[PDB]
Paper text:
IcmW-Interacting Protein B ([name]) is a 60 kDa Legionella effector of unknown function originally identified amongst a cohort of proteins that interact with the Dot/Icm T4S chaperone complex IcmS/IcmW10. Our data reveal that [name] is a modular effector, with an N-terminal Ser/Thr phosphatase domain related to the eukaryotic phospho-protein phosphatase (PPP) family, and a C-terminal domain sufficient to pilot [name] to the acidified LAMP1-positive lysosomal compartments in eukaryotic cells, where [name] interacts with the v-ATPase and the associated LAMTOR1 phosphoprotein, key components of the lysosomal nutrient sensing (LYNUS) apparatus. We propose that [name] is a lysosome-targeted phosphatase that modulates cellular nutrient sensing and the control of energy metabolism during Legionella infection.
The crystal structure of the N-terminal domain at 1.7 Å resolution comprising residues 25 to 344 revealed that [name] harbours a Ser/Thr phosphatase domain related to the eukaryotic phospho-protein phosphatase (PPP) family. The resulting fragment, WipB25-344, also yielded a stable protein, which in contrast to WipB1-364 crystallised readily. The structure was solved using the Molecular Replacement method, with the recently solved structure of WipA (a protein with 34% identity at amino acid sequence level) serving as a search model. WipB25-344 crystallizes as a dimer in the asymmetric unit. In chain A, density for residues 332–344 is missing while the same region is resolved in chain B, This region in chain B interacts with chain A, probably an artefact of crystal packing as WipB25-344 is monomeric in solution. The structure of WipB25-344 is very similar to that of WipA24-435 determined previously (the structures align with a root-mean-square deviation in Cα atoms of 1.9 Å over 279 [name] residues). In the PPP family, the DxH, GDxxDR, and NHE signature motifs are strictly conserved and comprise most of the residues that form the catalytic site14 [name] exhibits similar motifs, namely GDLHA, GDELVDR, and NHG, and these motifs cluster in one particular region of WipB25-244, on the loops connecting β1 and α1 (GDLHA), β2 and α4 (GDELVDR), and β3 and α5 (SNG). In [name], Arg310 (equivalent of Arg369 in WipA), is conformationally restrained away from the active site and therefore cannot assume a role in substrate recognition.
Author numbering: 24 to 331
The structure:
Amino acid sequence: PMTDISMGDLHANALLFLNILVRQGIIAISPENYAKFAEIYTLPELQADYWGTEAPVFSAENKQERLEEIKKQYNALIAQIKIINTKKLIRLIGDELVDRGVIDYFILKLLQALYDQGADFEILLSNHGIEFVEACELFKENGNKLVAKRLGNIQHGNSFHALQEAIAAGAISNEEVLNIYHQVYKKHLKIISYSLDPDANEIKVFSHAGIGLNHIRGLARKFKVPYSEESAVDLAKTIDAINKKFAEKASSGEIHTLYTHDMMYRGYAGEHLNSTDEVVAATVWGREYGDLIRTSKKFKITFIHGHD
């Protein structure tokens, strides 16, 4: 009923996420419940780098009790949030999980409420989000635990560490997290996305990091779909095909097969990722994939992405 919502990198800040959803007319929440939400979000016992590296709650003898009381009240607030706009599209440019914010549980519950009440949203694949994907996809492999040791070496994921510790303390269940992963999170994931104006032969391409047409061509090759750039409409059709193949990988629990960990170390380090098999790593890290192509004579394009 207005322009698409495009959110910057949230860094797992659930209150920032809430604020945008309220200010953009997606959700209604009372002022008193908003204040309760902000209070829970900034509880000293949940803040890392406050009295130690760890949030105080995780060194407390009664950590389970503390976390249970926070969790039940948090979920009571979620249950009082109403989605009031199901037509406005919400695009998350990424970093909604596994990042500097307090705990991934908070944004996971928000995503679940958005989905359950019919909001339209999409999540652009990021290096942070990919660690959550891998942890969930390899849950059984890792002995029924959410872990991602090698990916955790290249980025700070306080909010995911807090999730792991809360699960270890018995306050949050693997089954709840995994249900949200499979039922909510993974089917709203896109590698790249777009807004298309067919009459103007113009397209806006959205991605977590800086890419060009060369990345999209590499992705079409990686997923074995035809690449066409004969028009803005044709490029949109190509992007649809790329995301359809990606969703099949999401469904089979095989997103983690689209990269190797050496690609992610070199991605973090800032290197070129020019080999065809590295194109997913090159896209999420915004690294060189051959010559960067940002103009076509056959249509107008603007690229929209986050920064670092």
